[PDB]
Design a protein around this nucleic acid. Structure first.
Ligand SMILES: [Mg+2]
Ligand SMILES: [Mg+2]
Ligand SMILES: [Mg+2]
Ligand SMILES: [Mg+2]
Ligand SMILES: [Mg+2]
Ligand SMILES: [Mg+2]
Ligand SMILES: [Mg+2]
Lengths: 216, 109, 225, 63, 51, 128, 124
RNA sequence: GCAGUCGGCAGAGCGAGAAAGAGAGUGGCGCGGACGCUACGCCGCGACGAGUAGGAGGGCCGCUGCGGUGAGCCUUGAAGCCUAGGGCGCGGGC
RNA sequence: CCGUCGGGCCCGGGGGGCCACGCGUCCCCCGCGAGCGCACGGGGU
RNA sequence: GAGACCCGUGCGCCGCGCUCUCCCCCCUC
């Protein structure tokens, strides 16, 4: 019986620990740790009692079948992938949505979701952008920021919450969640001057204004 | 409400003098006249928007006459800010000198 | 029965696992030893220059015993003596590279093929990355990539060359079995050199590419490899 | 471009009997398996001799 | 077998060369040691200007 | 609704245009079917730049998709009801095609048989 | 023997179809209808065949008998199976495997039983 | 390289740096297990690919006629011919 | 005598990394521990 | 992997090192 312990060497870089083999042998204390040396259900009938087999035979075989594939190793599903966020994106940053029906509009980033999508609202009282997901490769991260350390994001605002369902109406829960986040983040917006109008404005390219020259 | 793409010109195909490789296009982006300025646009998506006679379907919309060859920026071309781009279909040579929208959203910043 | 046959075959598997870990520890400690050999040669050469500079004399280094030769011209218009020496050097394409051990007989052959080769004296790093990136064996007359240590050790293991680091050590410190350890190697098929060329058709000392660029072959190896 | 001559790449040695004799071909089918799956070089010489022409298989007299 | 570069693939490099693990554990530990000695000396210079 | 193959790889073709015979546009007496040009001064044989391309073996298709239909099957000519049951086992990758001289009273029989055998027919509604 | 008869008929049989870069054998007991040595239904001492029954329901299985090889009248033994699909495949698998009767034809016969049974179940 | 599909007559090995035996003896419940193999077949590695005159190989390229064969096709429409139809083949062609 | 981040597993006497960590005898010298996972790991999910 | 004392992918080779079959302590929910 053993409660698990963390790995006794830290990560130096990826793939290599800090301490070597004999050092990790001492830190695991293996010098004092020498050690030495389903298919059938029986069911009654009315006869007697039968041995019923589960996993019964296939009634039909396809005329041709694909062979089983070779094994691969580094290939993980999307629920297990690692989540990279750009270091210019921090909680409370202002984003510019570039793609959807709210394109060019400026929004307040809050939290990265578990699928890597950026949970965001530039508030519905300013943008008409609700609590909504965006994508970091499709948003522009400007270096203007609001401190949202004291902001309680609800724990249920997840990707399962934000997933499309199947004639669309906002539910009462989605109505009250936007209020519950807006009533908190809006006094932080209005405590820095002109940012409410800045978020009300949209981003547009004009003559002579080039994106490789403009710093955001 | 306003423009969200950079202006570029289909300056020609990737070519030597007597051999043009139609699969790669040379873009001239407005405002980019040095190879140091090209680093923003590398990897960005580029669109040749054009109109034809028969209607085609518009994503998130009703069918109209506008049609798009999509593409993306691959690398810079020369010291003077010209850029190499690759499109899904090779761009028609009738578009040489005409406008390509360079979108902003393979964002890296 | 079969209960003793099963443990008899598991004993064979366990014995082979212990043999593999013994060979693994051998490869580890021998590469550890080669690291110290390289550092003793490097610091001994520096110290040998320093003790002569204290005394006011000159320390002449040993004339180099390993050359890396890159064929830089094409297969068109080659005079037959030059072509013969190039196929004896296993350079039958442009930008093929081989290691050559240096003596009078080899240097006079490189002297024949001076307009067609560019060569010089390779670094330990150049040998390392040449074997690691472009190293291909000649096993059973086929070009097998050096992906396993057993892939070298089945051919050169009888000369006590059993891993990539004996192979690199045998090539670098030009050893007793250099001919076998270099003929085992396929001639390296290097890329075009990145950053362009100075002048391919003239000698290196007259501002071009061909010839003996003495320790300057390593700069070329970074751009070709 | 590689400087190699291709005049003698293709070996001009028989891979099969030119005869369409099915009895000789069943013998060749036996000795292909034997010459491949045994360590004996006799089976290889037998298979390559089963390949040959009648002139390269001259008769053996009793004496 | 697909050839992977041991100069870019760490555990292909360790498969061919078990001592590369030790040589890359050192000159990362040694490099961090040298960098903190360098910043300790850079701080000692600006501290000695304050005497 | 339709009968699918066992697998559907993308059928990559190195060329899709046919290999036109040299100078078959300038004449009606020269049919479009390919002939190797064998003249001494011939630009197409000499492989000059910007000319009609000659067929090479390098143009040959992938062996996994050679002779494969765009549906993903490979066709087999069928002349009667009896020559369908050779495809009774090859049905997931090989399809049937009724020959052009099979009458309209027998095409019905071959189609209604292949519907039982789940064999895909390239031309089910042909004559009728 | 069987290999000799194969070296006779491998390219010169009347059951040979060579069309459209394919090859088929129209032989009565050829499972998969493939011109092969293994799937040939005439040249072996032991053959399995599977075909639909005389009436439209069921699968008849054919086994070649050991004695009268030169006697085609009493050579093949036919057995009609009209059960459910799982029982029919159980019967064919037990006829091939428990008898050790030409055992590499086991799932060729099983898949042919499945194909005939699917062809006998009607389309909507 | 593969005849090793060696299955309740079972035991599912033979890529592994180092000549040879997963040798054998005797004293001290539940009935299961993809594909394959036209062996003239199938599979795997590696290197290579210019071509006149010329030589050789493969043609499930094509025409006509004969000998066998397809319980073949066909007046519910053969040959031929036309076709902005669908396709296949590197191609001959289908 | 002097010098060597010299070579001797850095010969030998009085804080930090090591593919070093059973015992018993004789002399030399100063063959089968078990489980669980993670992965720069035998060619994309 | 089990194995003639049992019949289970229908994630395993090489190579790297993680925890548990020992005992304590600290820190955070
Ligand atoms: Mg020249
Ligand atoms: Mg460059
Ligand atoms: Mg070539
Ligand atoms: Mg030639
Ligand atoms: Mg010749
Ligand atoms: Mg001429
Ligand atoms: Mg040729």
């Amino acid at each position: 019986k053993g409660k698990p312990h963390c790995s006794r060497n830290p990560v130096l870089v990826r793939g290599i620990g800090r301490y070597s083999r004999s050092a990790m042998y001492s830190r695991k204390a293996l010098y004092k740790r020498k050690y030495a040396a389903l298919a059938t259900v029986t069911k009654p009938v009315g006869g007697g009692t039968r041995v019923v087999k589960l996993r019964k035979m296939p009634r039909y075989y396809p005329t041709e079948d694909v062979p089983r594939k070779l094994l691969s190793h580094g290939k993980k599903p999307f629920s297990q992938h690692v989540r990279k966020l750009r270091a210019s994106i921090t909680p409370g940053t202002i984003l510019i949505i570039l793609t959807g029906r709210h394109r060019g509009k400026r929004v307040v980033f809050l939290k990265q979701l578990s699928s890597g999508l950026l949970l965001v609202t530039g508030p519905l009282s300013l943008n008409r952008v609700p609590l909504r997901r965006t994508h970091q490769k499709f948003v522009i991260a400007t270096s203007t920021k609001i401190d949202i350390s004291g902001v309680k994001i609800p724990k249920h605002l997840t990707d399962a919450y934000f997933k499309k369902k199947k004639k669309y109406e906002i539910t009462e829960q989605r109505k009250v969640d936007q209020k519950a986040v807006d009533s908190q983040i809006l006094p932080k917006i209005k405590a820095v001057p002109q940012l409410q109008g800045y978020l009300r404005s949209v981003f547009a390219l004009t003559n002579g204004v080039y994106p490789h020259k403009l710093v955001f | 409400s306003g423009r969200l793409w950079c202006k570029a010109i289909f300056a020609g195909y990737k070519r030597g003098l007597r051999n043009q490789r139609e699969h790669t296009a040379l873009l001239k982006i407005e405002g980019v006249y040095a190879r140091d300025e090209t680093e923003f646009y590398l990897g960005k998506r580029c669109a040749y928007v054009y109109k034809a006679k028969n209607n085609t379907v518009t994503p998130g919309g009703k069918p109209n006459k506008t049609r798009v060859i999509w593409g993306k920026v691959t690398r810079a071309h020369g010291n003077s800010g010209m850029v190499r781009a690759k499109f899904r279909s090779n761009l028609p040579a009738k578009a040489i000198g005409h406008r390509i929208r360079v979108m902003l959203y393979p964002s890296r910043i | 029965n079969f209960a003793e046959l099963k443990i008899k075959r598991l004993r064979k598997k366990f014995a082979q696992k212990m043999l593999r870990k013994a060979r693994r520890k051998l490869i580890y400690e021998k590469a550890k030893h080669y690291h110290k050999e390289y550092r003793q040669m490097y610091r001994t050469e520096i110290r040998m220059a320093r003790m002569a500079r204290k005394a006011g004399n000159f320390y002449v280094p040993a004339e180099p015993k390993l050359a890396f030769v890159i064929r830089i011209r094409g297969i068109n218009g080659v005079s037959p003596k030059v072509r013969k020496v190039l196929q004896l050097l296993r350079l039958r394409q442009i930008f093929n590279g081989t290691f050559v051990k240096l003596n009078k007989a080899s240097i006079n052959m490189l002297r024949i093929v001076e307009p067609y080769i560019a060569w010089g004296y390779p670094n330990l790093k150049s040998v390392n990355e040449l074997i690691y990136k472009r190293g291909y064996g000649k096993i059973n007359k086929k070009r097998i990539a050096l992906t396993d240590n057993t892939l070298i050790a089945r051919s050169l293991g009888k000369y006590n060359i059993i891993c990539m680091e004996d192979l690199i050590h045998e090539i670098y410190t030009v050893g007793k079995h250099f001919k076998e350890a270099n003929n085992f190697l396929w001639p390296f098929k290097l890329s075009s050199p990145r950053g362009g060329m100075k002048k391919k058709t003239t000698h290196f000392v007259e501002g071009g590419d061909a010839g003996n660029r003495e320790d300057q072959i390593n700069r070329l190896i970074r751009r070709m490899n | 471009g590689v400087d190699i001559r291709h005049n003698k790449d293709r070996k001009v040695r028989r891979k099969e009997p030119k005869s369409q004799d099915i009895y000789l071909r069943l013998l060749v089918k036996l000795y292909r398996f034997l010459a491949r799956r045994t360590n004996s070089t006799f089976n290889q010489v037998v298979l390559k001799r089963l390949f040959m022409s009648r002139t390269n298989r001259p008769p053996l007299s009793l004496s | 077998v697909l050839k992977k570069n041991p100069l870019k693939n760490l555990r292909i490099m360790l498969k061919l060369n078990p001592y590369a693990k030790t040589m890359r554990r050192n000159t990362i530990l040694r490099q961090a040691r040298n960098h903190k000695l360098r910043v300790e000396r850079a701080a000692a210079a600006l501290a000695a200007k304050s005497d | 609704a339709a009968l699918r193959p066992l697998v559907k790889p993308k059928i990559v073709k190195k060329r899709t245009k046919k290999f036109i015979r040299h100078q078959s546009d300038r004449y009606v007496k020269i049919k479009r079917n390919w002939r190797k040009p064998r003249g001494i001064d011939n630009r197409v044989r000499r492989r000059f730049k910007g000319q009609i391309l000659m067929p090479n073996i390098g143009y040959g298709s992938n062996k996994k998709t050679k002779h494969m239909l765009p549906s993903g099957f490979r066709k087999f000519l069928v002349h009667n009801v009896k020559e369908l049951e050779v495809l009774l086992m090859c049905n997931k990758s090989y399809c049937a095609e009724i020959a052009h001289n099979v009458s309209s009273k027998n095409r019905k029989a071959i189609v209604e048989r292949a519907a039982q055998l789940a064999i895909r027919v390239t031309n089910p509604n042909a004559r009728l | 023997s069987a290999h000799l008869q194969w070296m006779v008929v491998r390219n010169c049989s009347s059951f040979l179809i060579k069309r459209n870069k394919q090859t088929y054998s129209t032989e009565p007991n050829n499972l998969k209808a493939r011109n092969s040595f293994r799937y040939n239904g005439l040249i072996h001492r032991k053959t399995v065949g599977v075909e639909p029954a005389a009436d439209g329901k069921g699968v008849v299985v054919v086994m070649k008998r050991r004695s009268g090889q030169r006697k085609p009248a009493t050579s093949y033994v036919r057995t009609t199976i009209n059960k459910n699909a799982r029982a029919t495949l159980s019967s064919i698998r037990h006829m091939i495997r428990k008898n050790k009767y030409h055992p590499d034809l086991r799932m060729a016969a099983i898949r042919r039983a499945s194909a005939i049974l699917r062809s006998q179940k009607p389309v909507m």
